[PDB]
Design a binder for these strands. Structure first.
Ligand SMILES: [Mg+2]
Length: 1036
RNA sequence: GGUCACUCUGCUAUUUAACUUUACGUUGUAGCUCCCUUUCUCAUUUCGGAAACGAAAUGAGAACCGUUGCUACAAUAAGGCCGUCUGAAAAGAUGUGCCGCAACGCUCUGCCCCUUAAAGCUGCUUUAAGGGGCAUCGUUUAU
DNA sequence: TAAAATCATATGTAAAGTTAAATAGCAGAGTGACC
DNA sequence: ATATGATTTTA
């Protein structure tokens, strides 16, 4: 066959792959083949969006269900008498004054209709119930009075948020309303009715029930049939304390030593004996004259030995719960067998509801103790090793054995249980282990590419993959990194301690967002960074008092990084909406408030990176998934695939820094020429990168002070690039590579590409004259393959609903806010002529404010009668919009634009092609469209399809298409189809931004097309084979 | 001696998946409401008149439609279902009711492509066996 | 004018929480491949 | 990014 090395540059969206032939001494000698697999889809996540849509489906459905149940309950308790309901089960003549009725129920009897309206309104708007284990008289009255005698509206609004009502405040309202209405008569104050209404209002499903944790929990390292153990387990805590104890090291004057058996015995039961065993305390218990330090620590400008080193969190948690419930003496030790401690830790870790926990503990532990435990405990996180393996390992570590010693005595080695069964073809990725569809897709596509090169060229000798790791750093660099991480650790400790201070009643310990809140409270000086008012730290858990605002919105930045979050008031955050602080304070004209906000920012303890981001006034993603893909790939490949290389480790995990340095050392520095083809180039370097070069680079950067991106060292002040030490594979490596990868010659991107075998072979036999091994069998050009998306589902329609009452005309009607009503919108306002004075006044404001609606309508706009008096305020106006097509939604009461076109069917009649667009909602419906696009006309005047039309094929996104238009011949990848125009759009495989519009041929006609035919292509860019459909495919 | 990979532990930073809720936003429908096109009915006032009667203009009042603001109800993908109790059925009662914008895969089905063999035919076709790829198929994924 | 290109404009949003999984890096203990 | 109205250019 042939001996090559396969190199891989894998990203979130692409797999650049390359092959290099090596000799019997495994050096590189020839570039055999290369390609780029682009498997992404048209651009949070798709899975995240799916999850949010599912959650809102469940929310809508559960509210509808409980309101249905409420109407039913009202019927069964005789409140309503079935002359009250209609065909739809709705209540006829249901009054629409429930706030006023909720206020009046404090002072009079209510009509059965009034009282039903009150109950349904309370249950529909039921407020937020805390989910953490732990006027007046009425929120209604209060709302009515201040808000409406003073705000004009009761409900919250987009830019004017006004109230926050607890579910318990509304529960108090409900109870007080039944008590009052029973003072006044109201034969509808049943005990059953009360129970039912209050249960419908208060009930909500648990966040975790049953096996929810177990289905997510991992499995043991050593015995994979067993689940992980919880950290809040006597066995797991004893394991962690034994590993900290056996691995503890005293750095003496010059020598270091492990703890003596006697010292280990002096410490063993210390974390059990007291709340925490700190380093300074252990120091005092150990003798340890002052010229003795601990390997680890920090030993900075703080009391480092005050840091903990161990507390038996679960031991003392259980102990303190039992103590606080008068069941264990504080002085006395905990009185439960370790098996029971493990069982109760596992219980509160796997299960969170009282029901589920008791269902696993009642027969194991005494009901007084279980009562005390449900009350004060919260547990989580689970260590990496099951309880079984830990029960086997921790006794040996009690004896002094190291971690690996015990693991090797018991299981043979401390590497754990690995499945390694070589196969020639990489086995599919388990996908049980990877709950990340983007990572899973990248891994599956890399598998497809690898098994493709194996089906085509046999087994690779060695596979080199580019990871996301960084080169072993200097000793100064990583100690600076350590200082900064340690600064953060101490900030998190201070926040957690502050939180324990203010909230002694909290059950469990602070969670991450809790440390986030208080760490912001610290860095911000205890004030809302938008309003300047101090934050009442006593109520952080009150829903709505303060909210963690993504300063730059998630919908616009997809950013959750700490530098993006500020701690602001609930009202302030919600009025901010999805604006940036710059937009929110209008800092174009430095508003009185934008000057203040900026100042508040500059006087904060924020890092100067966060400060710059909080104020950006400018726009124009994810590498975690990439590193994850790669670590997994390397591990997977090594563990499971046949390789011909000489050694035992035939997979080399590389990283971008080694590729960057080799491209800088070999000439391929490539400022900003980023086009899909480049991923092949990297792959080549990855295949040429070897372990020796890894090691040598690491030595130069760590011990010889080399910068690990530019490749330069500075002596005095010389600035020398270390190019010499890393010879490229062959002399003219750069030139050949550039030609093979990109078609054109290295020096000039200006030249037209060689786009076939003959042109490319001639070009590279010419340019590099001397090297005759450059050309050979496999020197086909680089044609970037793209995965096809032939999936039939997707977003059915856009999410704005528009009025279709005038759809025959060909217009939708949507009510636009004035602050958004720009002057081109105004002339399409519906009452442009019905209300001429209104049109003219709106025009006047827009013209006076240079057509800036936010400034034009910052002052409230009202209508005026003929007498000149002020009348109603205008905050929005219906506006007409063209609508020639759409999706009926919301019980056929509105219409929305199309969102996703699933496929385009092509037919032929008289050597003319026609296009039938099919969208997602039609699949939902089961409709297979009859009419093909006519450019100028609406869909009714489109071409009916019947027996007289020859179906050619169907077309999904990124299917390969060839269109010949006696003006030009074009080949690609289908992207879009224009219903208005009837044309298609195609991506050029390499998305070369010089041809088309950013690499997309927009507006390609296929009506007069000489030839219009669909192709396929493999993972490598090989085997381009046109295919013809036989029978037109249904949609269901 | 170094670098690396992996095992476990503490930590820092970031991300993913799953779940439970809130409040908005949009559309429709109502009630009160703002403007306002049209159309009636009446009044007043000018014109005309032999009479009755007609004509304008203004001002009240309605009504269709448009529609401003507040409140409520319904819907919140398009589309499909499930338990329990009555009931011969028709169907009624009922529920912390369940799915639907992602991904993987090849066991069943559909659908594209390649190889090998056999036979035919003057490059195609049928039978067979194997091998891929994508799915409207199986599953993660159900009351 | 019919068909093909080009330009142009619009896309749902803010929170509260219970969880599990992953990776990059710092540090501590180890084994083994590899330079 | 896609979906598609609105406009200009081309056969
Ligand atoms: Mg915000």
């Amino acid at each position: 066959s042939i001996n090559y090395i396969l190199g891989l540059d894998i990203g979130i969206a692409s797999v650049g792959w390359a092959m290099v032939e090596i000799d019997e001494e495994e050096n590189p000698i020839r570039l055999i083949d290369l390609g780029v697999r682009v498997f992404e889809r048209a651009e949070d996540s798709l899975a995240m969006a799916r999850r949010l849509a599912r959650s809102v489906r469940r929310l809508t459905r559960r509210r509808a269900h409980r309101l249905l149940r409420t109407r039913r309950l009202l019927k069964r308790e005789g409140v309503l008498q079935a002359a009250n309901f209609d065909e739809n089960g709705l209540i006829k003549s249901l009054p629409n004054t429930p706030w006023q009725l909720r206020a009046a129920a404090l002072d009079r009897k209510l009509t059965p209709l009034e009282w039903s309206a009150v109950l349904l309104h309370l249950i529909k708007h039921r407020g937020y119930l805390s989910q953490r284990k732990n006027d007046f008289r009425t929120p209604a009255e209060l709302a009515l009075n201040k808000f409406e005698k003073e705000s004009g509206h009761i409900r919250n609004q987009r830019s004017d948020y006004s109230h926050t009502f607890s579910r318990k405040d509304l529960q108090a309202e409900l109870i007080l309303l039944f008590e009052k209405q029973k003072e006044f008569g109201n034969p509808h104050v049943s005990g059953g009715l009360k129970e039912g209404i209050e249960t419908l209002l208060m009930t909500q499903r648990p966040a975790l029930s049953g096996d929810a944790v177990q289905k997510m929990l991992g499995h043991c390292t050593f015995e994979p049939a067993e689940p992980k153990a919880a950290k809040n387990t006597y066995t797991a805590e004893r394991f962690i304390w034994l590993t900290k104890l056996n691995n503890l090291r005293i750095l003496e004057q010059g020598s270091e030593r492990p703890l003596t058996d006697t010292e280990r015995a002096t410490l063993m039961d210390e974390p059990y004996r007291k709340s925490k065993l700190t380093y300074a305390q252990a120091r005092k218990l150990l003798g340890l004259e002052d010229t003795a330090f601990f390997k680890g620590l920090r030993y900075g400008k703080d009391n480092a030995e005050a840091s903990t080193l161990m507390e038996m969190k679960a031991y003392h948690a259980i102990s303190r719960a039992l103590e606080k419930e008068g069941l264990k003496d504080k002085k006395s030790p905990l009185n439960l067998s370790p098996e029971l401690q493990d069982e109760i830790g596992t219980a509160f870790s796997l299960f969170k509801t009282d029901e589920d926990i008791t269902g696993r503990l009642k027969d194991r532990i005494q009901p007084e103790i279980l009562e005390a435990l449900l009350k004060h405990i919260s547990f989580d996180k689970f260590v990496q090793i099951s309880l079984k393996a830990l029960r086997r390992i921790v006794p040996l570590m009690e004896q002094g054995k190291r971690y690996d010693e015990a693991c090797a005595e018991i299981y043979g080695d401390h590497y754990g249980k690995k499945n390694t069964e070589e196969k020639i073809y990489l086995p599919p990725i388990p996908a049980d282990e990877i709950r990340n569809p983007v990572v899973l897709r990248a891994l599956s596509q890399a598998r497809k590419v690898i098994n493709g090169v194996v089906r085509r060229y046999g087994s690779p000798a060695r596979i080199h993959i580019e990871t996301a790791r960084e080169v072993g750093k200097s000793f100064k660099d990583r100690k600076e990194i350590e200082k900064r991480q340690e600064e953060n650790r101490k900030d998190r400790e201070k926040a957690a301690a502050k939180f324990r201070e203010y909230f002694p009643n909290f059950v469990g310990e602070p969670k991450s967002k809790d440390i986030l809140k208080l760490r912001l409270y610290e860095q911000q000086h205890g004030k809302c960074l938008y309003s300047g008012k101090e934050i009442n730290l006593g109520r952080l858990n009150e829903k709505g008092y303060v909210e963690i605002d993504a300063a730059l919105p998630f919908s616009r930045t997809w950013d959750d990084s700490f530098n993006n979050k500020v701690l602001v008031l609930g009202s302030e955050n919600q009025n901010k909406g999805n604006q940036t602080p710059y937009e929110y304070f209008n800092g174009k004209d430095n508003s009185r408030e934008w000057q203040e906000f900026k100042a508040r920012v500059e006087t904060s303890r924020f890092p100067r990176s966060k400060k710059q981001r909080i104020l950006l006034q400018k726009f124009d993603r994810n590498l975690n998934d990439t590193r994850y893909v790669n670590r997994f790939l390397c591990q997977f490949v090594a563990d499971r695939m046949r390789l011909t290389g000489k050694g035992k480790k035939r997979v080399f995990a590389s990283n971008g820094q080694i590729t960057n340095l080799l491209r800088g050392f070999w000439g391929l520095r490539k400022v900003r020429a980023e086009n899909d083809r480049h991923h092949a180039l990297d792959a080549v370097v990855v295949a040429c990168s070897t372990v020796a070069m890894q090691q040598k680079i690491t030595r130069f950067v760590r011990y010889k002070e080399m910068n690990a991106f530019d490749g330069k060292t500075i002596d005095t002040g010389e600035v020398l690039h270390q190019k010499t030490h890393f010879p490229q594979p062959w002399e003219f490596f750069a030139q050949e590579v550039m030609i093979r990868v990109f078609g054109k010659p290295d020096g000039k991107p200006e030249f037209e590409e060689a786009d076939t075998l003959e042109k490319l072979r001639t070009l590279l036999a010419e340019k590099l004259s001397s090297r005759p091994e450059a050309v050979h069998e496999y020197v086909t050009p680089l044609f970037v393959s793209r995965a096809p998306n032939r999936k039939m589902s997707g977003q059915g329609h856009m999410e704005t609903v528009k009025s279709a009452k005038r759809l025959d005309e060909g217009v939708s009607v949507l009510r636009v806010p004035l602050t958004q009503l720009k002057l081109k919108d105004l002339e399409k306002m519906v009452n442009r002529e019905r209300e001429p004075k209104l049109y003219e006044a709106l025009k006047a404001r827009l013209e006076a404010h240079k057509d800036d609606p936010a400034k034009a309508f910052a002052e409230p706009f009202y209508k005026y009668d003929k007498a000149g008096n002020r009348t109603q305020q205008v905050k929005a106006v219906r506006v007409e919009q063209v609508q020639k097509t759409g999706v009926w939604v919301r019980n056929h009461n509105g219409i929305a634009d199309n969102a996703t076109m699933v496929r385009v069917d092509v037919f032929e009649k008289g050597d003319k092609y026609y296009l039938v667009p099919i969208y997602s909602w039609q699949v939902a419906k089961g409709i297979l469209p009859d009419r093909a696009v006519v450019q100028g006309k609406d869909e009714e005047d489109w071409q009916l399809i019947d027996d007289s039309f020859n179906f050619k094929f169907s077309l999904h996104p990124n299917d390969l298409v060839e269109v010949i238009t006696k003006k030009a011949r074009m080949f690609g990848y289908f992207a879009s189809c224009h219903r208005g125009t009837g044309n298609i759009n195609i991506r050029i495989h390499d998305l070369d931004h010089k041809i088309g519009k950013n690499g997309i041929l927009e507006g390609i006609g296929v009506k007069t097309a000489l030839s219009f035919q669909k192709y396929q292509i493999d993972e490598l860019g090989k085997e381009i084979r046109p295919c013809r459909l036989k029978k037109r495919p249904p949609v269901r």
